[PDB]
Design a protein around this ligand. Structure first.
Ligand SMILES: C/C=C(\C)C(=O)O[C@H]1C(C)=C2[C@H]([C@@H]1OC(=O)CCCCCCC)[C@@](C)(OC(C)=O)C[C@H](OC(=O)CCC)[C@@]1(O)[C@H]2OC(=O)[C@@]1(C)O
Ligand code: ALF
Ligand SMILES: [Mg+2]
Length: 994
């Protein structure tokens, strides 16, 4: 029964047809269970050991490489016996890496916890229902509960289902709805309808929600909805499925691979319309099976030259290193691809409670009565330092530390805060911090008493355990708490009946201590306390009191104000009915106003500066909280999201106000407003979605269960170290430091990493560009196989795989955080940069094929085969009366292939120096700055010698150890690749933009 909150208790019972006293008949339970199902949250486990492997062979850059891998296995069988020394080497390596990289993508994806499983921890095992089966309450499985069931909940119990409250047995029902609102403050419930059908969870005060727990009291109700039809079920539903998309860099890679799949097929066709003028004369040298060998061996060698293999290993290497760095920075990363993204962040959606604030209620302002003289009334206002529950702070009178014992009004004020209090303070010796025991708004009073110390008790010598309730203990030694009249909705206050320590059972020195809402309490005050004296409550006095209440309860302050009063002449204990709470307000009449305490959940000390750093980095921060709009806007002004005098009429909406807006204006409000309050879990994820509709990478940070739907939907989910398990599992990153400043440092790392990532991406891609131009020449110009795909797999993975990672340690810019966020749709290769790598690509491709022809044309230790008689590389064994030369094995010699590969390696080592910077000369930008790059080139050149020395290495690669003769020509062809790119750099920074 949806919208049961808008209906009466009678209408809800009539909806399911069930008596409140008897409950559902066993037949009704049968029919309802078949209709609504079991009260369960369906578990999810899509990530298996099998499906993850299947996912690996789905990528476009993999299927092409896999397709070429299959072919390679076929074209390796067709081989003679003169060169069978290398039988199946190519099909092995091409499949080895395809598994070596696919086994990595699984190891960094299956290791993830289940947010839903953590969410189901809020599902109670059992539940108490009232069936027609028997009069006594049955304790059944919480899953066997059906809509319409009569359910009883008690204090400490975890709510089993979404319930429309029928009757409250206790005086009040206090409920902790932190999983839906993010606020652990006890919510007072009732059994009256909530007319608004569009009401949010914070408005449904007649509803009990599954997962939430009864903080205090006992009540009966009827089940509205079960399973995923519940509010916690909504949270569950928004955390399933492909929840997360692809990294903006991976989108660029997929864009590259998409065009690559179309151009590779284009080149293979291109080398077909040119090879026509030759079929006019046949040749009994080879049929279709022998004439197609050169057409498919170049089709698979083209993909190897194009696809930048080894890059997933380089990226993974670069990401793993950054994670270790940020872990020292106190940021724990759960998702590697999110590191990259974090940098491109433009908007940061932040939770308020627990994230921006300390989640510890603190009395920051309080005032008593100074002087009352006729129509004049002055107040002694005080301010308190400290943002936690620790007894560590100072009472300030106009920014001056003054003891509270000197003020008699503060003495009795602290007395009420200690006596009229069901909560207490405790020091967790394990965590080493002070924790609360009971209501947070009450522990704030306990902490206040300790801070004040109105009796000047020597507490600097006491331990942290004793310090917790030291000053509070002393106050208990003066007045003995007889009984307490608990809180009630009609009264909006609470009181305690106290008696002087050690006295007769017939004296008359008892007192009462009232605490509650300013409106109700002060109205029941007929007197005013000045220190220890008492004066009657008058007009000007009451106005002066209420004025400061309104100034503290609203505006820049906006604090939860509590009126504190005492009844100096309490009624006789014999004439007071304690079993009836309706008479408690009468007992709290003719009061004496003492003072008012103002409390708040204060922001963390380092938040304001952190947000400013984000603004300087061009990153806006939007608060999305389940708390009220009053405190939300107030905090925003404190931490600098809003100006102290800035108008925010259209820059701050509630979830209710946000839903009233047309869908067009909702989307615009996300770009305008920076504060959203009193929201549901679905609202947070909806705001994130709207921001993502503007092509914006958005970060979400929180600590509660209600944050999880937005933590997942956002690009970067950020959790707090002291946050919930549900929040951590749904986040990509966790702040072990619990500081917002950690996020800023992490973004700085994210930006710095990407710039280095952006470098070797360009470097490896440009490397693969030149390789394709090389293959394009040999297939078109007529030259034999200059480079085989077996060699290229060792170049792009080892030869170029090391300087690539070495470019991951490039020195970041000093203005890395003084520059606005980069565009998500920013191409890595465009403009003049595209012309550079195209010229380099055409250079590298010509430097390899050309060097291969150097062994034939401009040679010295090789044959003098001219350009004309080299095109017919095939017609040498079948054609001699027309073509007379030397040998036929010269075309497949291990010297022109080694000559071309040596050039390729040398250029890349030089191109890596040109990849250290984009538009800066090597003179102004010293290549010896990157120490890790120098040691990488030397290591790369060391393996280039190793593969030419140790005999089992140049065998499978078909290479010959080039002497110091042909090696000198390399420094005349490969070396001047610096100047080519240098000129392009000079023009780019002089005729475009420096
Ligand atoms: C690496 C191998 C190269 C040869 C390749 O095929 O990639 C092309 C192609 C897919 C693009 C091109 C390549 O185009 C060519 O270089 C022409 C090739 C055809 C001539 C045959 C040789 C004689 C990139 C590589 O070339 C530059 C270097 O000039 C740049 C860029 O790529 C990026 O920005 C990388 C994004 C991760 C892309 O234009 C990209 O397509 C677009 O979607 C982008 C935005 O991706
Ligand atoms: F802690 Al919140 F919205 F402020 F979940
Ligand atoms: Mg929170």
């Amino acid at each position: 029964m949806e919208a049961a909150h808008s209906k009466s208790t009678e209408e809800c019972l009539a909806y399911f047809g069930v008596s409140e006293t008897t409950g559902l008949t066993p037949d009704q339970v049968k029919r309802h269970l078949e209709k609504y199902g079991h009260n369960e949250l369906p578990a999810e486990e899509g990530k298996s050991l099998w499906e993850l492997v299947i996912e690996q062979f789905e990528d476009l850059l993999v299927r092409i490489l896999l397709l070429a891998a299959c072919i390679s296995f076929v074209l390796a069988w067709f081989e003679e016996g003169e060169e069978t020394i290398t039988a199946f080497v190519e099909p092995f390596v091409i499949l080895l890496i395809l598994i070596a990289n696919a086994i990595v993508g699984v190891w960094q994806e299956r290791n993830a916890e289940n947010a839903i499983e953590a969410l189901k921890e809020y599902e109670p095992e059992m539940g108490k229902v009232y069936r027609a089966d028997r009069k006594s309450v049955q304790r059944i499985k919480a899953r066997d509960i059906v809509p319409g069931d009569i359910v009883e909940v008690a204090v400490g119990d975890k709510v089993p289902a979404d319930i429309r409250i029928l009757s409250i047995k206790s005086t009040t029902l206090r409920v902790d709805q932190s999983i839906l609102t993010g606020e652990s403050v006890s919510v007072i419930k009732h059994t009256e309808p909530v007319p608004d059908p569009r009401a949010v969870n914070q408005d449904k005060k007649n509803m009990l929600f599954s997962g939430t727990n009864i903080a205090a009291g006992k009540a009966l109700g009827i089940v509205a909805t079960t399973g995923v039809s519940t509010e916690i079920g909504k949270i569950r539903d928004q955390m399933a499925a492909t929840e997360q998309d692809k990294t903006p860099l991976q989108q660029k890679l997929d864009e590259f691979g998409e065009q690559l799949s179309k151009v590779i097929s284009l080149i293979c066709v291109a080398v077909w319309l040119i090879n026509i003028g030759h079929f006019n004369d046949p040749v009994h040298g080879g049929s279709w099976i022998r004439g197609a060998i050169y057409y498919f061996k170049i089709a698979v060698a083209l993909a190897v030259a194009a696809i930048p293999e080894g890059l997933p290993a380089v990226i993974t290497t670069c990401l793993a290193l950054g994670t270790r760095r940020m872990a020292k920075k106190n940021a724990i990363v759960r998702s590697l691809p999110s590191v990259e993204t974090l940098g491109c962040t433009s908007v940061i959606c932040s939770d308020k409670t627990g994230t921006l604030t300390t989640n510890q209620m603190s009395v920051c302002k309080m005032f008593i009565i100074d002087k009352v003289d006729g129509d004049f009334c002055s107040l002694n206002e005080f301010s308190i330092t400290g943002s936690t529950y620790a007894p560590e702070g100072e009472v300030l009178k106009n920014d001056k530390p003054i003891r509270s014992g000197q003020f008699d009004g503060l003495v009795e004020l602290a007395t009420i805060c200690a006596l009229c209090n069901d909560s207490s303070l405790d020091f967790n010796e394990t965590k080493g911090v002070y924790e609360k025991v009971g209501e947070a708004t009450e522990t704030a009073l306990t902490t206040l008493v300790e801070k004040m110390n109105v009796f000047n008790t020597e507490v600097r010598n006491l331990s942290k355990v004793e310090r917790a309730n030291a000053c509070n203990s002393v106050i208990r030694q003066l007045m003995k708490k007889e009984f307490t009249l608990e809180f009630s909705r009609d009264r909006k206050s609470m009181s305690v009946y106290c008696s002087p320590a050690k006295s007769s059972r017939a004296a008359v020195g008892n007192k009462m201590f009232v605490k509650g809402a300013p409106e109700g309490v002060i109205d029941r005050c007929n007197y005013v306390r000045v220190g220890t004296t008492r004066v009657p409550m008058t007009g000007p006095v009451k106005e002066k009191i209420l004025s400061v209440i309104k100034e503290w309860g609203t505006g820049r302050d906006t604090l939860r104000c509590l009126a504190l009063a005492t009844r100096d002449t309490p009624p006789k204990r014999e004439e007071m009915v304690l079993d009836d709470s309706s008479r408690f307000m009468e007992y709290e009449t003719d009061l004496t106003f003492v003072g008012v305490v103002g409390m708040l959940d204060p922001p963390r000390k380092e938040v304001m500066g952190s947000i400013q750093l984000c603004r300087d980095a061009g990153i806006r921060v939007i608060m999305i909280t389940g708390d009220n709009k009053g405190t939300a806007i107030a905090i925003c002004r404190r931490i600098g999201i809003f100006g102290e005098n800035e108008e925010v009429a259209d820059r701050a909406y509630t979830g209710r106000e946000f839903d009233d807006l047309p869908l067009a204006e909702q989307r615009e409000a996300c770009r305008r407003a920076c504060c959203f309050a009193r929201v549901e879990p679905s609202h947070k994820s909806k705001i994130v979605e709207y921001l993502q509709s503007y092509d914006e990478i958005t970060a979400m940070t929180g600590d509660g269960v209600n944050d999880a739907p937005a933590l997942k939907k956002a690009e970067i989910g950020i959790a707090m170290g002291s946050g919930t398990a549900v929040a951590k599992t749904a986040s990509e990153m966790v702040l072990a430091d619990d500081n917002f400043s950690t996020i800023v440092a992490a973004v700085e790392e994210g930006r710095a990493i990407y710039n280095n990532m952006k470098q070797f991406i360009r470097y490896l891609i440009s490397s693969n560009v030149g390789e394709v131009v090389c293959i394009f020449l040999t297939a078109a110009l007529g030259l034999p196989e200059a480079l085989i795909p077996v060699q290229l797999l060792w170049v792009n993975l080892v030869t170029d795989g090391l300087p690539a990672t070495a470019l991951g340690f490039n020195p970041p810019d000093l203005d890395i955080m003084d520059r606005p966020p980069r565009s998500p749709k920013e191409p890595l290769i465009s403009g003049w940069l595209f012309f550079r790598y195209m010229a380099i690509g055409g250079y590298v491709g010509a430097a390899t094929v050309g060097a291969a022809a150097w062994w034939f044309m401009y040679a010295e230790d090789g044959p003098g085969v001219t350009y004309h008689q080299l095109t017919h590389f095939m017609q040498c064994t079948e054609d001699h009366p027309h073509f007379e030369g030397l040998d036929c094995e010269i075309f497949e010699a291990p010297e022109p292939m080694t000559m071309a590969l040596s050039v390729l390696v040398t250029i890349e080592m030089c191109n890596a120096l040109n990849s250290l910077s984009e538009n800066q000369s090597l003179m102004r930008m010293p290549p010896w700055v990157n120490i890790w790059l120098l040691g990488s080139i030397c290591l790369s050149m060391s393996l280039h010698f190793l593969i030419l020395y140790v005999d089992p290495l140049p065998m499978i690669f078909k290479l010959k150890a080039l002497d110091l003769t042909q090696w000198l020509m390399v420094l005349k062809i490969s070396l001047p690749v610096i100047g080519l790119d240098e000129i392009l750099k000079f023009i780019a920074r002089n005729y475009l933009e420096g």
